[PDB]
Design an enzyme around this catalytic site. Structure first.
Site, PDB file in Angstrom:
ATOM      1  CB  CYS A 214      -3.255  -8.706   0.918  1.00 31.78           C
ATOM      2  SG  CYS A 214      -4.666  -9.407   0.004  1.00 31.78           S
TER       3      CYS A 214
ATOM      4  CG  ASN B 287      -2.991  -1.019   1.317  1.00 33.97           C
ATOM      5  OD1 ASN B 287      -2.971  -2.244   1.299  1.00 33.97           O
ATOM      6  ND2 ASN B 287      -3.321  -0.303   0.254  1.00 33.97           N
TER       7      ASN B 287
ATOM      8  CG  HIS C  16      -6.086  -5.540  -0.764  1.00 35.53           C
ATOM      9  ND1 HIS C  16      -5.743  -4.305  -0.256  1.00 35.53           N
ATOM     10  CD2 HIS C  16      -4.982  -6.306  -0.698  1.00 35.53           C
ATOM     11  CE1 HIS C  16      -4.470  -4.319   0.067  1.00 35.53           C
ATOM     12  NE2 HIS C  16      -3.989  -5.534  -0.184  1.00 35.53           N
TER      13      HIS C  16
END
Ligand SMILES: *[C@@H]1O[C@H](CO)[C@@H](O[C@@H]2O[C@H](CO)[C@@H](O[C@@H]3O[C@H](CO)[C@@H](O)[C@H](O)[C@@H]3O)[C@H](O)[C@H]2NC(C)=O)[C@H](O)[C@H]1NC(C)=O
Ligand SMILES: *[C@@H]1O[C@H](CO)[C@@H](O[C@@H]2O[C@H](CO)[C@@H](O)[C@H](O)[C@H]2NC(C)=O)[C@H](O)[C@H]1NC(C)=O
Length: 308
Positions: A92, A272, A252
Site C-alpha cells: 500500500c 483505497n 495503511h
C-alpha cells in the site's frame, strides 16, 4: 496472527449502534470471511526525511470551496478515477505513491496518461523498507526524486486482481489462494524490447494538518496519506467512517482525492487499493477535522519533472 475471522455479526451490530447511523458497516459484504493475518497484511505502513511544504501568501490565503473532487477539477486526467488493487502484499505504501505520481504527471507534468510502476518501487527501493512486509511513504517519494521509476507499461504490477468474495462479479480469483513475496528488482522492462524510460520528481516534501491537506490538493492534485486501521474499518460499506470498536491492525497508505460535507459531517474522499468491490466502488469517506485515526498526521507529495 490467527486464522480467526476479523468480523462477526455481533461485532457489526455493535458498530452500527455505536456509529449512530453516520456510516454503515456490513458483515455479509466482500470482507465477511477475511482472516486476522490477511487483514494485517493489507496494512503495509512501517516507520521526517522530507522537507516541510511551504505555501506562498496566495496559496495560504485563497478561499477554498466547501466541496472538491480531483476527477471533476481535472476531467482530462484519466488516471485520477482509476482504482488500484495491491493484491495479497503489504505494498500500500508503494501503490498509493505510484497512483498519486501517475495523477501528478497529468496535473503538473504535461503527460496525460502514464501509470508509474508500483512494482518497480516495491522491489528496488530497499531503503524504503522490505517490499510486501511494508515500508515508508516519505522514503518512496524521496526515491522518486533521487532514482526515479519506470511506467507500468515497462514493468506491469506482478500480482493479479484478487477478491475476498465467494463469487466475484469481476470473476477475480480468491486472495486466500495467494501470499506473495517482494518481487526481484529488474533494470530492463519485463519485455526487454520495450525501452526503459525513467520518470523523476524534481522536489518531494511532507504535509501535516487539515489546512495543509486541502491547499496541497486544490493547487497540485492527489497525494499519499496514512491512518491506523481498526477491525471496524474492514467492514466499511458507505457513509463517513469514524472508529468506534475493534483492535489495531496496522498503518495503511491511501490516496486523498477530495473533501465535502454530508448532513453537517465534514469528510475526506479517499481512493483505497482493495479494488472496486470494497467500500463505495473502491472509495471511502472518513471524518475530517479531528485527525480521525491520525489521517491528518502525515502526507507525502512531490512535483513530477516533465520529460525532455
Ligand atoms: C522482475 O522480473 C521477474 C521475471 O523474472 C519477475 O518475477 C516473475 O514474476 C512473474 C509474475 O509477473 C511470476 O509468474 C508467476 O509464476 C508463478 C510460479 O512461481 C505462478 O504461480 C503464476 O502463474 C505466475 O505466472 C514469476 O514466477 C516470477 N519469476 C521469477 C524468476 O522471479 C518480477 O516480478 C519482476 N519484478 C518486477 C518488479 O517487475
Ligand atoms: C464466506 O464463506 C461462506 C461459506 O464458508 C460463504 O457462504 C456460502 O457460499 C456458497 C458458495 O460458495 C453458497 O452456495 C452457500 O449458500 C453459502 N454457505 C453457507 C454455509 O453460508 C459466503 O458466501 C462467503 N462470503 C463472501 C461474501 O464471500
Amino acid at each position: 496472527a490467527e486464522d480467526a475471522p476479523v468480523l462477526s455479526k455481533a461485532f457489526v451490530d455493535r458498530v452500527n449502534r455505536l456509529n449512530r447511523g453516520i456510516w454503515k458497516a456490513k458483515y455479509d459484504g466482500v470482507m465477511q470471511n477475511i482472516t486476522l493475518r490477511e487483514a494485517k497484511r493489507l496494512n503495509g505502513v512501517i516507520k521526517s526525511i522530507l522537507p516541510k511544504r511551504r505555501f506562498t501568501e496566495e496559496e495560504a490565503c485563497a478561499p477554498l470551496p466547501s466541496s472538491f473532487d480531483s476527477a471533476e477539477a481535472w476531467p482530462n486526467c484519466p488516471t485520477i478515477p482509476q482504482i488500484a488493487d495491491q493484491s495479497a502484499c503489504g505494498s500500500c505504501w508503494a501503490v498509493a505513491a505510484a497512483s498519486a505520481m501517475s495523477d501528478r504527471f497529468c496535473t503538473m507534468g504535461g503527460v496525460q496518461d502514464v501509470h508509474i510502476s508500483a512494482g518497480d518501487l516495491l522491489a528496488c527501493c530497499s531503503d524504503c523498507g522490505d517490499g510486501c512486509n511494508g515500508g515508508d511513504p516519505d522514503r518512496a517519494w524521496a526515491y522518486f526524486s533521487s532514482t526515479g521509476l519506470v511506467s507500468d507499461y515497462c514493468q506491469p504490477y506482478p500480482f493479479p486482481h484478487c477478491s475476498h468474495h465467494s463469487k466475484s462479479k469481476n470473476g477475480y480469483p480468491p486472495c486466500s489462494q495467494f501470499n506473495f513475496d517482494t518481487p526481484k528488482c529488474n533494470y530492463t522492462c519485463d519485455d526487454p524490447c520495450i525501452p526503459v524510460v525513467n520518470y523523476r520528481s524534481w522536489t518531494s516534501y511532507a504535509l501535516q494538518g487539515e489546512d495543509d491537506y486541502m491547499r496541497e490538493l486544490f493547487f497540485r492534485g492527489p497525494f499519499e496519506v496514512a491512518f491506523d486501521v481498526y477491525e471496524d474499518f474492514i467492514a466499511y460499506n458507505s457513509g463517513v467512517y469514524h472508529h468506534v470498536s475493534g483492535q489495531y491492525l496496522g498503518g495503511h497508505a491511501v490516496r486523498l482525492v477530495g473533501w465535502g460535507t454530508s448532513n453537517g459531517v465534514p469528510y475526506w474522499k479517499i481512493a483505497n487499493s482493495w479494488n472496486t468491490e470494497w467500500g463505495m466502488d473502491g472509495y471511502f469517506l472518513i471524518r475530517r477535522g479531528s485527525s480521525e485515526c491520525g489521517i491528518e498526521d502525515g502526507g507525502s507529495a512531490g512535483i513530477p519533472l516533465a520529460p525532455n
